[PDB]
Design a protein around this ligand. Structure first.
Ligand SMILES: C=C(C)[C@H]1CN[C@H](C(=O)O)[C@H]1CC(=O)O
Ligand SMILES: C=C(C)[C@H]1CN[C@H](C(=O)O)[C@H]1CC(=O)O
Ligand SMILES: [Zn+2]
Ligand SMILES: [Zn+2]
Lengths: 258, 258
C-alpha cells in the first residue's frame, strides 16, 4: 500500500531540512527530488515513504558478483518501488530497470576556479599543469572509459594514470578540491550540479564551455511494474504544465547567492 | 519481414536527394532521420523501407471522429512499424504509442529577421507592432493553447485573435514570412529548426532568447510492439557512442553556410 521511494542525499535534489533531527519520515527532507516525488505521487495517487539508499550508490553491476548496487539494485531486487534521484538514464541501466522520459536534461561539463586559463575539454587535454578528474564511479567516469573520440580517450588515459589520484568520492569533495587547488584542478561533472554550485557562495567557480554529451535523468521503476506507465505519464504531464521548470528555478536560481 | 518506417519531408531530417527522380526506394532520400533510421536498423538488425506519410501530418486525434492522423495514426492503425521523424514526445502521443528515449533535445524558441528589436517572449508579449505566430497545428500551438503561464496566455490570446492569420502551414512558410515582413513578424518554432535555418543563406534570421520549454524527439513504435525495446536501446547506444552528436553536427553545422 505505502510505496517505497528510494533516493539519495545530493544537493539540491535531496537534503536534510534545517531541524531534521526533530522531524520524522518524509518531513526530514527537502529539495528538487523531494518536491518531484510529491508531485508524481499526487498524480499517480499513491502514499509513499522516502528511503535513503543504504550503500550510498546510484547503480552499477559488479563485474565479479553480477550484483547491482545502489538505487538501481534496490529496484532490481524488489526492495524499492520507485527511485527518484538525479539518476542518469544510461543504456546499462535501461537494460534492467524502466526509466520514465527525462525530467531534466543535462550533460558532462567542466568546472574551474574563476581565473583558470581553460575554455574547453581540448584545452584541458593538451596539457598537464592543470590536473582534472571525475567522480570515482558514476556515469561520467563511464563516459570517459568508453569514449572512442580522441580528445576524450586522451583525457581518460591521463586521468587513469595521473598521480596522485584525480578521482574524488563525492560532488562536495570535487568542489572542495577545485576551490583549494588555486586554479590547478578542474572537475568534470554533470552540468546540473555544475550550475547549482556556480550559484553558491563563495561564488569562485564557473562552468566553462559547452557540454560534452546530451542526456537526462529519469525516474526509475522495476521492469514489469504497474507503476511504470503512470509514472512515465506523470513526468510528461509535469513537464508539460511547466512544473519541472518551476522546480528547477526554485532549487537552482530563486535561491541563488551569486 | 521488411519493416515499414513512416517518415515525413522536413529539412534536414528528410529531404529528396539531388537526383531523386532517377532513384528508387530508400535511395531517394537523405538527412538526419534517414541516417538515424539506417543506424537504428543496423543495431536492431532489420530490413526496412522508408514511406512518406500520405497526409503530411505528424499526429493528432480528431476531437470529432477520434481518428489519429499523421505518422502517429500510421502506427496506431498498424499501417507502419516505426516512425522516425522530428516527432515531439508529448503526453497525448505517449498515451497511444511508445516513444524511445529522446534522440534530440529541444525547445520552443523565437526566430527573428536580423535587426528586429526583440530578445524574449516577454518583449513580444507586451506589444503588437511586431506580429508573431506558430505553425497552424503541431506541438508548439498546443503548448500555447494549454499554457497557464501569464506571458504565454497573453501570447496565445493575441495569436488566437490576430488579423489576418498569424499561423502558417509549414516551416518554410513561416521562414519566408519572417524573411519578407521587414522585421514585423517573428516565428515561434522548435529550436532545432530555428538553429538549422540560422545556418542557411541568406543568413538573415536568428534565434533569440532561451527556449520556452525543454523536450525531445523520440522514435515511435505501436504499443505492444516487439521492436519497442530494441529500438529504445538502439537510441541509447547511439547516443552513448556519440553518433547522435555526429549526425546533428553533420546535418546542421558541417554544411553551415553562415
Ligand atoms: C552524484 C552522482 C555520483 C551521480 C548522479 N548522476 C550520475 C549517475 O547517475 O551515475 C552521477 C554523477 C557523475 O557520474 O558525474
Ligand atoms: C514540423 C512540424 C509541424 C512538427 C515537428 N515537431 C512538432 C510535432 O511533433 O508536433 C511540429 C513543429 C511545431 O509544432 O512547431
Ligand atoms: Zn544535520
Ligand atoms: Zn525534385
Amino acid at each position: 500500500r505505502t510505496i517505497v521511494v528510494t533516493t539519495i542525499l545530493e544537493s539540491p535534489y535531496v537534503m536534510y531540512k534545517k531541524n531534521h533531527e526533530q522531524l520524522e519520515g518524509n518531513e526530514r527532507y527537502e529539495g528538487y527530488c523531494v518536491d518531484l516525488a510529491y508531485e508524481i505521487a499526487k498524480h499517480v495517487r499513491i502514499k509513499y515513504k522516502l528511503s535513503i539508499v543504504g550503500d550510498g550508490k546510484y547503480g552499477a553491476r559488479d563485474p565479479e558478483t553480477k550484483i547491482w548496487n545502489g538505487m538501481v539494485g534496490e529496484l532490481v531486487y524488489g526492495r524499492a518501488d520507485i527511485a527518484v534521484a538525479p539518476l542518469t538514464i544510461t543504456l546499462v541501466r535501461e537494460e534492467v530497470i524502466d526509466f520514465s522520459k527525462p525530467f531534466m536534461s543535462l550533460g558532462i561539463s567542466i568546472m574551474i576556479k574563476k581565473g583558470t586559463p581553460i575554455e574547453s575539454a581540448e584545452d584541458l587535454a593538451k596539457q598537464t599543469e592543470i590536473a582534472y578528474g571525475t567522480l570515482d564511479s558514476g556515469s561520467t567516469k563511464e563516459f570517459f572509459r568508453r569514449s572512442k573520440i580522441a580528445v576524450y580517450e586522451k583525457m581518460w588515459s591521463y586521468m587513469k594514470s595521473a598521480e596522485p589520484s584525480v578521482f574524488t568520492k563525492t560532488t562536495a569533495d570535487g568542489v572542495a578540491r577545485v576551490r583549494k587547488s588555486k586554479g590547478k584542478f578542474a572537475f568534470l561533472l554533470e552540468s546540473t550540479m555544475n550550475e547549482y554550485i556556480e550559484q553558491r557562495k563563495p561564488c569562485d567557480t564557473m562552468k566553462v564551455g559547452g557540454n560534452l554529451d546530451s542526456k537526462g535523468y529519469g525516474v526509475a521503476t522495476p521492469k514489469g511494474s504497474a507503476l511504470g506507465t503512470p509514472v512515465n505519464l506523470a513526468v510528461l504531464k509535469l513537464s508539460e504544465q511547466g512544473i519541472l521548470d518551476k522546480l528547477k528555478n526554485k532549487w537552482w536560481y530563486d535561491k541563488g547567492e551569486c
